[PDB]
Design a protein around this ligand. Structure first.
Ligand SMILES: O=c1[nH]c2ccccc2nc1C(F)(F)F
Lengths: 301, 296
């Protein structure tokens, strides 16, 4: 139906069906064992950020690859359940909709993961060329297929060029996996989110070290953001003033799965609402903190 | 008396095909993913259907989007879902299956959804005149014995020409299930049940457990790559070497393929030797393929 002009936040990236099983002891190959509990969860960075923005009170839309089937059916119903607009999905004729199987040992708490197959093609620049951008006030891209995502990001810059400053689409990028191909995405977006893993792999031993060491890579006037678990988060703008927020840990830590995604979405939300980078770092840390003492995303606000 | 009835589980098998079994706390990526209609009695229905045998499934199912897929698989196959004991409380069971492509080993992490099992009450509603054979997957032993007694009673009232052949499977090493040994013309005992009783071969297990079977019953024990063995009233051991494929890619449901093919051959009046041999034959073809298409 009718989405008002420049009203939505779009998240471009991965959706996956995570089957999570809790077991007494790790299964030995060729065995038939019974789990304590089993959960079917909708995962993926851009998918999780959508759930959060819906819960935060934001009209939001997801854009990722899915193949028609029963896995896609569960995921779409979950998106819809979290009030996410699913009309921009790139429906693929060939490939398997991602599904990862996870095994949690009730004993040592260790996570054994069997990642989804590579069969499904990622969203292309041509798939993206087809999108009428006027309904989006902000577009967020989870770095995956950088070459292609660069063309998408050039398109938003092109769109923006012919628009008044009050009708310009704000853009954020996320470099979460420590893969070389992605490091070119640093040059795009008004807000750049770099992870602890990417920073550590690049050498940096802290968020100040990362932000001071990678700010050169950003486009003129961009804000480089880094969350460092318990150390809270830092942000660095074009003024050179390193901003910081201490973490807001929960009384006890329940589930940290999707905490960075909660951080990203909350920062995007705060900025989209006209708040300062400092007000936004604080908001992000408050919400990502509340989430960690919760099972899933129910009651994060 | 035409159809073959299978009593037991139906489970959604969420399959991931790996090149090597994952190490604890590791993070491997699978080659392919698939959903499959699992559960022992359900797998046996796929096989019987494929062998051209009119069959039916009776098991507990919760209406939903999972069961809708399962029923669409049964229907695509030709399995009579009419006897499904539909429940209201709970969800349909589901399992995570890691299939090692290199050797075909299958690791199953099962989620049993508390779904109430098919009871003697559900079974009394069944018209036993359409059935040629009845196979029961050892689950609620005390409850299934009542279902078995009901079949013997129908048999006493019928000529040897129109009697129902009955087969039982004891797959899990649960002491409740040993009562089933017990009933039925054919009794399938798994290698894992046999090992859990101190037996180190299919021949050992048969010589040991035969005393526990109904008078005139055939006790059958498959032993993976070591083939299968059988023992009847005559006290003569029957053996069948296996039919391994050059490259073993999927052992998920091989035992159910064996059981169903053994039932199929016997239902068609072939000797226990021929049936043993056919079971190994079909279980072998299946191990070289992913799933069940192309086993015939
Ligand atoms: O691995 C196997 N598992 C079986 C399980 C039951 C009956 C026959 C089987 N054959 C094989 C194989 F050796 F032929 F492949």
């Amino acid at each position: 139906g009718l989405v008002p002009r420049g009203s939505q936040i779009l998240c471009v990236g991965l959706v996956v069906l995570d089957v999570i099983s809790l077991v007494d002891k790790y299964p030995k190959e060729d065995s038939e064992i019974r789990c304590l509990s089993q959960r079917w969860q909708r995962g993926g960075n851009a998918s999780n950020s959508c759930t959060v923005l819906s819960l935060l009170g934001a009209p939001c839309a997801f854009m990722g690859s899915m193949a028609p089937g029963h896995v896609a059916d569960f995921l779409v119903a979950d998106f819809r359940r979290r009030g996410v607009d699913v009309s921009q999905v790139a429906w693929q004729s060939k490939g398997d909709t991602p599904s990862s199987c996870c095994i949690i040992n009730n004993s040592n708490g260790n996570r054994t993961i069997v990642l989804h197959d590579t069969s499904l093609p990622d969203v292309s620049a041509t798939d993206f060329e087809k999108v009428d951008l006027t309904q989006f006030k902000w577009i967020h891209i989870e770095g995956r297929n950088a070459s292609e995502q660069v063309k998408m990001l050039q398109r938003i810059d092109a769109h923006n060029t012919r628009q008044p400053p009050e009708q310009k689409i704000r853009v954020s990028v996320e470099v979460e996996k420590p893969r070389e191909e992605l490091f070119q995405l640093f040059g795009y977006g008004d807000v750049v989110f770099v992870s602890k893993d990417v920073a550590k792999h690049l050498g940096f031993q802290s968020a100040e070290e990362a932000l001071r060491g990678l700010y050169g890579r950003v486009r003129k006037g961009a804000v480089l953001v880094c969350a460092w678990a318990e150390e809270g988060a830092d942000a660095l703008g074009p003024d050179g003033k390193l901003l910081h927020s201490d973490a807001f840990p929960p009384p006890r830590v329940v589930d940290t799965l999707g905490a960075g995604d909660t951080f990203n979405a909350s920062v995007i939300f705060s900025l989209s609402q006209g708040r300062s980078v400092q007000e936004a770092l604080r908001f992000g840390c408050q919400v990502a903190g509340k989430k960690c003492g919760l099972q899933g995303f129910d009651g994060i606000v």
